[PDB]
Design a protein around this nucleic acid. Structure first.
Ligand SMILES: [Mg+2]
Lengths: 44, 207, 216, 221, 226, 255, 49, 293
RNA sequence: AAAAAA
């Protein structure tokens, strides 16, 4: 339903690319990188 | 009744060319489903069959599968519950020969057949070949291994189910009618079987 | 293959035995039933006959392994936990000497998985038990089960023996096996990720709980 | 809206309470944490067994709705992750209808909520916050909003309502609405006017409830 | 007194480190400290005292349990009705043995302490403290009589030595007593009339709940049997 | 509950061309039974049948008065099997089957129960199965048959309600019989034993009225395992088998 | 969850709101009642019944 | 779920009964003091015996009588036990041994004893009549289910008053409570049940039996025999139910009837008194409200 | 569905 309140049939292709976008994004997850302070370690 | 809403108990109820339509796999609640609609003369029948399984039974030591069939009244309350159990027992005597039970050890297959709409312008004898058609479709759609396609026909109240291309019989239902119709009913139902068989096979391939 | 490609349930595919003539010698093709097929008996000309008959609607596949295997592939059921397979499970309850779970999905072979659909509020789902000795190869004798698994945590394991017809026996001894997905405080907190093999941390609330983690 | 309540009227139960509002009187009881049945076991959270019986006859589908609505309120209240794989039996028995039980069940619902929460307190269960429920109705003619009406006021009422809010910080700040039931003909303007008077009266019973606990719990300690 | 309600703001500042305890809950996500019960907040240590008739397994707690089952691995002991069972190992007894097992039938009263108690795991008790001379009254309780009371009356009786119960009962009669933190009190005397006199007192004292009414009840109870 | 070693033995024995039964019976032989009748004074008719395996069925016949214009079914058969529910699958199946066997427009004359043009006798048939080691459909059938042969009702006085205070009417009718058959291999069998049905490939339920085969006729699965399809010639053979050996059993149960 | 029974006339019948996982802001009620009005007005006249 | 009882308790209570002592400090022939409180509405009644707390509510509706008895009325009792009385009782269990027993005992005390007139509950013969229902709510379980439910039902029926009905042709009309006063149900006699508990201790072995009246929850689990006798002020036995248990002489049976008659007579005069005090309580309140008009 | 002697 749009702003006017009129029913709009969602295309059968619309949901297809939604699955293509989801399956592609879920297959390769971005590696979560977080750093922790280590005052006990020293360089060479 | 504390289970459902039956309303006032002091009240009383109201007092007053073969064509087929096959559809399968329209229910996502189960493993296999089927819709069968037949219209002939002044009598049409629409029923739905759902198949849930095969699902594992805990502690079961059965080396083969276990089939359970139950018929239900969807809308019109006509057939007696006692008679529904009888047909169910007849139907299970059929598919226990049809279904390859050796494939599902320690498992069980539940079959629900909903009798939705039946117009009539014995009695339940005519619906039997449609119940067999529905179940055989729902089982084949579900993935259950069937040794052969089960089908039947109704001739003068005499129902007989065939497999292996009508060469053998997996079920026989004779009620009322008359005598000496043995050879005739076997030939008339065999034509209905072959007709129902090809439409069933075509139904599974097309969709 | 001189045999029908498409097969509905009840359709004749090929007889019991077969043979052909090549290189001046008779080659014997041995037809054996498979998933989707069933060897049954037919009668014709007053004489018995045995032939491979498909029981499921689909395409016929004739393959050979180092004999001709005849099977029918549909357009789940065949997939069942067998010794050596990898299975994703969920912890249902924790005891002191063991840890019982329930089987959700099973890893396929060359990742892809086979999800077993069942009702978790009934008990129809396959149940499995992970022994305390099968937790890790390191120190098999003394293992604290509380510091390894947790109710609700997802555990990737491998089935050793089926045992009886009730519970499956799994193990998380190797590196690629252990708790995969888990949350803080039995699922009340935020998501946690696997860092060390024996330590699971959460890069959100800074919470750290002791689990048995697998290798990324 | 003068009410009355008691705490710990039952012996063999872990916690109990007796709520009184107008004519509707609903006594509640709570046992837990105890050993759960195999079918009720929840590996992480805490299981809730809720039972609501009427004043006359046997529990029907009507009471099944009362149990379902009561469950929605007590669920977020109790910290389920404190008692993994355990059981809590909550039974609410209605002693008197206090209304027309055939046409209206929203008066008894609020009382079942109030009595249950008090029993949860007495039984010593982990609660995230506090709660209070009041029955509301709107007369067709006067078109006024009445908080905690009577039996005769419901018969001529156009629409009936039920409000249950969650309270934090000394029973002042409202975290979230737990339950909001409404039945009958009403518009949107009457709805926001219902919460305006409801939230005020709810907090009035919250602070009223709080002092009831103090008078009963403190002498035990 | 300072009365506390669930969901209310916590008076104690989050700046200074404060050790947790029973009565308060640490939110696994928002990391805020909130009260979950109703009672009086005691700050020395932070915990909340609330009225409860149901006991929960906790480390270092003295409990009186009843053997409801005998297995090969351990004992099944119920510290309270309808509650989950507790695991009492065979090695949890003084002078333990391998092949030889301690003699305990179904229904025998045992006075033990809870060693390991996890929320998501079956609790465990041991019939020998860890440790206080191995004899704090631990072991089988022969004969006598037990009484069910609330948890508030049980803990104050065992811990607080200013509680005028063991003080007032010792003057009326000479007896040995064992008190569990699960609301169970086991008292054994010589004559049965004395045990009955002790049962009726605690039954009335727990009901009325008055510190200065102990001597009054005990006087009229012991003179009633005669 | 037989072992596979027993089932494989009994099958190879029954499926053989000179079919050997475990008890030596020929394919048309019936096991010796025992029928007691008229042992219930409170009921209009009664019967009791003991079988070889220890199966037992008690059938009671009672009646009342009602308008036959408002009641289409003047014959109600109720089946109660010991240790079984009233809504059980097998119970309600037999309950529905026997009602088709004994019906006003099937195998029972409706004019026999006709007293006047307004009122008629409605017969209530009750069935109590004490012990059942097999399908009692044939056992119950022989019990209801002997129960209707020996029946006594209040004798009418007027014509076309009042009854005779002493003298009584003896209902003389031809009650239907139900013979269960077993299909093992290519051979047909009459009166299947307990252990025979567990290995039988299929089965037949055939009725009988007035020296002729009649409805209902069903094809029941005696088990759930070795159930297989059968050739049409077996149905023609089975029906003919019942046809020729029925005057023998009827003649026996007549005495 | 939020359950609404809206009528084409503009009024309402059944209103069920239960928050168990998050706070329920009044702006979401107005958003729910707005979406329920159009949903009910669409189902009122669709198949011309 | 089952109640776990220690071996020490079982030995203590049994030995105490041999010394004529019990936990609640009572006698063997003594019955627990019963207090009866009526609610606002008529028919609502609360009965309490020591720690045992029950509740009863009498209702009524217009229904049709059975075809077997068209000249009679309808009566039914609900004794369903909720877990409120304890976790020992399951939810929705009518197949309970002691539960169906309590239901039948109080049913035989009301119906088959001719206590309540079902013929006077018949509006139209073979058409419509009154249907009196009594729902027993078991609040707290300290024992004495049969006894407490027996008083609650009886006291409720005598305190209950059905709306006056006038027959107009085939139409049945109902008069409001403000226009006309409700007519009380007719009770010929008041039956009251007394529950006995038998014990057979060891040691001090030829002849030894212990019988107490109205046992508590702890005493009810240790008893070897159960006996329930129902008596009234009319010097007659309403009903008596002894199923198995410890075998007893016929003399000891009538010995328990004599001890019970002194108990039922005392509380029946208490019920009639509390009915009298409550009847005049509503009378003085009705006159005060009118005087301020 | 552990148990007894040494
Ligand atoms: Mg039966």
């Amino acid at each position: 339903y749009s702003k006017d309140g009129l029913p709009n049939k969602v295309k059968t292709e619309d949901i297809r690319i939604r699955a293509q976008n989801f399956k592609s994004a879920l297959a390769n997850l971005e590696d979560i990188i977080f750093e922790i302070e280590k005052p006990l370690v020293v360089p060479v | 009744d504390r289970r459902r809403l039956l309303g006032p108990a002091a009240a009383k109820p109201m007092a007053f060319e073969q064509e087929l339509s096959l559809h399968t796999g329209f229910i996502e609640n189960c493993n296999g489903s089927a819709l069968v609609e037949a219209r002939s003369l002044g009598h049409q029948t629409s029923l739905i069959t759902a198949v849930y399984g095969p699902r594992s039974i805990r502690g079961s030591f059965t080396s083969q599968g276990t089939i359970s069939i139950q018929l239900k009244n969807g809308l019109l309350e006509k057939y007696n519950t006692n008679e529904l159990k009888e047909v169910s027992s007849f139907l299970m005597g059929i598919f226990n020969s049809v279904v390859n039970l050796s494939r599902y050890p320690k498992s069980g297959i539940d079959i629900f057949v909903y009798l939705t709409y039946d117009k009539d312008l014995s009695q339940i004898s005519s619906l039997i070949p449609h119940c067999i058609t529905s179940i055989t479709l729902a089982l084949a759609d579900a993935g259950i291994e069937l040794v052969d396609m089960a089908g039947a026909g109704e001739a003068n109240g005499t129902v007989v189910s065939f497999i292996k291309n009508g060469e053998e019989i997996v079920g026989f239902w004779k009620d009322d009618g008359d005598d000496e119709d043995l050879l005739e009913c076997l030939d008339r139902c065999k034509e209905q079987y072959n007709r129902y068989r090809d439409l069933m096979i075509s139904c599974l391939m097309n969709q | 293959f001189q045999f029908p490609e498409i097969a509905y349930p009840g359709k004749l595919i090929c007889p019991q035995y077969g043979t052909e003539n090549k290189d001046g010698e008779d080659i014997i093709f041995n037809y054996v039933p498979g998933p989707g097929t069933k060897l049954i008996q037919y009668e014709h000309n007053g004489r018995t006959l045995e032939a491979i008959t498909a029981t499921l609607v689909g395409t016929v596949r004739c393959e050979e392994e180092k004999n001709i295997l005849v099977s029918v592939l549909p357009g789940f059921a065949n997939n069942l936990p067998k010794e050596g397979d990898i299975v994703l499970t969920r912890v249902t309850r924790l005891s002191l000497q063991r840890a019982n779970v329930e089987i959700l999905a099973v890893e396929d072979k060359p990742a892809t998985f086979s999800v077993s659909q069942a009702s978790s509020d009934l008990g129809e789902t396959f149940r499995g038990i992970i022994r305390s000795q099968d937790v890790r190869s390191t120190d098999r004798d003394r293992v604290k089960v509380i510091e390894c698994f947790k109710p609700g945590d997802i555990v990737r394991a491998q089935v050793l023996s089926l045992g009886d017809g009730t519970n499956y026996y799994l193990t998380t001894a190797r590196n690629d096996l252990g708790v995969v997905f888990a949350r803080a405080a039995n699922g009340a907190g935020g998501l946690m990720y696997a860092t060390d093999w024996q330590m699971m941390t959460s890069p959100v609330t800074g919470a750290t709980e002791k689990r048995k983690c697998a290798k990324p | 809206m003068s009410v009355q309540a008691e705490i710990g009227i039952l012996d063999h139960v872990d916690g109990s309470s007796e709520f009184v509002s107008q004519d509707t009187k609903v006594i509640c009881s709570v046992t837990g944490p105890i050993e759960p049945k195999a079918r009720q076991e929840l590996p992480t959270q805490l299981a809730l067994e809720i039972i609501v019986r009427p004043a006359k006859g046997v529990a029907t589908t009507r009471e099944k709705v009362l149990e379902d609505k009561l469950r929605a309120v007590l669920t977020p209240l109790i910290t389920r992750h404190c008692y993994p794989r355990q059981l809590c039996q909550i039974t609410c028995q209605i002693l008197e209808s206090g209304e027309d039980e055939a046409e209206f069940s929203l008066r008894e619902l609020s009382c079942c909520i109030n009595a249950a929460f008090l029993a949860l307190v007495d039984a010593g269960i982990a609660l995230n916050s506090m709660c209070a429920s009041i029955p509301i109705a709107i007369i067709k003619d006067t078109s006024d909003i009445i908080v905690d009406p009577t039996a005769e006021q419901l018969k001529i009422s156009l629409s009936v309502h039920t409000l249950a809010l969650e309270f934090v910080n000394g029973g002042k700040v409202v975290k979230n609405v737990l339950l909001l039931d409404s039945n009958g003909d009403f518009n949107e303007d009457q709805l926001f006017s219902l919460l305006e008077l409801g939230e005020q009266k709810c907090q009035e019973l919250v602070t009223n409830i709080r002092r009831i606990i103090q008078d009963n719990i403190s002498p035990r300690l | 007194s300072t009365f506390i309600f669930p969901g209310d703001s916590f008076p104690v500042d989050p700046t200074t480190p404060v050790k947790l305890g029973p009565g308060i809950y640490c939110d696994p996500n928002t990391q805020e400290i909130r009260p979950v019960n109703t009672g009086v907040l005691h700050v020395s240590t932070a915990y909340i005292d609330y009225s409860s008739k149901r006991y929960i397994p906790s480390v270092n707690d003295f409990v009186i349990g009843v053997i409801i089952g005998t297995f090969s691995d351990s004992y099944k002991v119920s510290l309270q009705n309808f509650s989950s069972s507790v695991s009492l190992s065979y090695m949890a007894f003084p002078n333990a043995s391998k092949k030889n097992r301690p003699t305990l039938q179904v229904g025998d009263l045992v006075y033990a302490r809870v060693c390991t108690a996890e929320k998501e795991l079956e609790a465990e008790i041991e019939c020998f403290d860890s440790t206080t001379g191995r004899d704090a009254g631990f072991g089988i309780l022969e004969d006598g009589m037990i009484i069910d009371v609330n948890l508030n009356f049980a803990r104050q009786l065992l811990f607080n030595n200013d509680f005028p119960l063991l003080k007032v009962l010792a003057a009326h009669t000479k007896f040995e007593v064992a008190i569990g933190l699960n609301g169970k009190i086991w008292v054994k005397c010589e004559e049965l009339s004395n045990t009955l006199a002790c049962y009726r007192t605690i039954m009335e004292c727990c009901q009325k709940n008055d510190t200065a009414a102990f001597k009054d009840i005990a006087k009229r109870q012991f003179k009633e049997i005669l | 509950s037989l072992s596979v070693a027993e089932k494989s033995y009994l099958y190879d024995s029954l499926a053989s061309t000179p079919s050997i039964r475990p008890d030596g019976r020929l394919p048309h032989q019936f096991r010796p039974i025992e029928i007691f009748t008229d042992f219930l004074p409170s009921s209009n008719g009664s019967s009791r049948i003991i079988a070889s395996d220890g199966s037992e069925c008690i059938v009671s016949i009672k009646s009342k008065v009602v308008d036959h214009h408002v009641e289409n079914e003047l014959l109600q058969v109720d089946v109660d099997i010991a240790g079984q529910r009233d809504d059980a699958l097998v119970v309600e199946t037999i309950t529905s089957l026997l009602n088709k066997v004994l019906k006003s427009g099937s195998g029972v004359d409706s004019s026999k129960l006709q007293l006047t043009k307004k009122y008629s006798f409605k017969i209530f048939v009750d069935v109590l199965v004490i012990s059942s080691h097999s399908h009692p459909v044939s056992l119950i059938s022989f019990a209801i048959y002997s129960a209707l042969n020996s029946t006594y009702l209040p004798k009418l006085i007027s014509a076309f309600p009042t009854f005779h205070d002493y003298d009584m009417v003896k209902l003389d009718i031809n009650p239907p019989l139900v013979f269960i058959l077993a299909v093992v291999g290519n051979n047909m069998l009459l009166d299947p034993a307990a252990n025979e049905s567990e290995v039988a490939n299929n089965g037949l339920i055939i009725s009988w009225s007035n020296g002729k085969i009649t409805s209902p006729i069903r094809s029941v699965a005696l088990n759930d395992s070795n159930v297989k399809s059968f050739k049409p010639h077996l149905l023609k053979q089975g029906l003919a088998m019942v046809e020729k050996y029925a005057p023998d059993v009827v003649r026996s149960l007549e005495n | 969850t939020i359950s609404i029974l809206a009528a084409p006339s503009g009024n309402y019948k059944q209103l069920t709101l239960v928050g168990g996982g998050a706070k329920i802001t009044p702006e979401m009620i107005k958003r729910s009642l707005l979406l329920s009005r159009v949903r009910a007005d669409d189902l009122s006249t669709r198949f011309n019944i | 779920k089952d109640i776990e009882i220690s071996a020490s308790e079982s030995k203590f209570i049994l030995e105490a009964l041999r010394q004529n002592y019990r936990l609640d400090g009572r006698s063997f022939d003594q019955f627990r003091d019963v207090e009866i409180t009526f609610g606002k509405e008529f028919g609502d009644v609360s009965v309490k015996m020591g720690n045992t707390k029950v509740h009863c509510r009498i209702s009524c509706q217009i229904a049709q009588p059975y075809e077997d008895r068209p000249f009679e009325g309808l009566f039914v009792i609900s004794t369903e036990i909720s877990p409120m009385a304890g976790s020992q009782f399951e939810n929705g269990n009518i197949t309970g041994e002691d539960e169906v027993l309590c239901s039948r005992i109080i049913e035989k005390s009301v119906r088959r004893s001719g206590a309540l007139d079902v013929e006077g509950l018949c509006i139209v013969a073979g058409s419509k009549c009154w249907a009196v229902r009594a729902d027993v709510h078991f609040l707290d379980c300290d024992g004495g289910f049969i006894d407490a439910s027996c008083i609650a039902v009886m006291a409720g029926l005598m305190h209950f008053k059905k709306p006056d009905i006038t027959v107009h042709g085939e139409q049945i009309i109902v008069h409001p409570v403000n226009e006309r006063e409700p007519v009380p149900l007719g009770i010929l006699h008041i039956p009251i049940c007394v529950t006995f508990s038998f014990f057979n201790p060891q040691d001090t072995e030829t002849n030894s039996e212990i019988s107490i009246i109205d046992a508590t929850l702890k005493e009810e689990l240790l008893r070897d025999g159960v006996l329930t006798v129902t008596l009234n002020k009319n010097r007659e036995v309403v009903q008596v139910s002894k199923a198995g248990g410890l075998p007893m002489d016929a003399l000891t049976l009538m010995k328990c009837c004599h001890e019970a008659y002194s108990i039922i007579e005392k509380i029946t005069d208490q019920i009639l008194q509390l009915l009298k005090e409550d009847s005049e309580k509503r009378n003085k309140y009705a006159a005060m409200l009118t005087s301020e008009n």
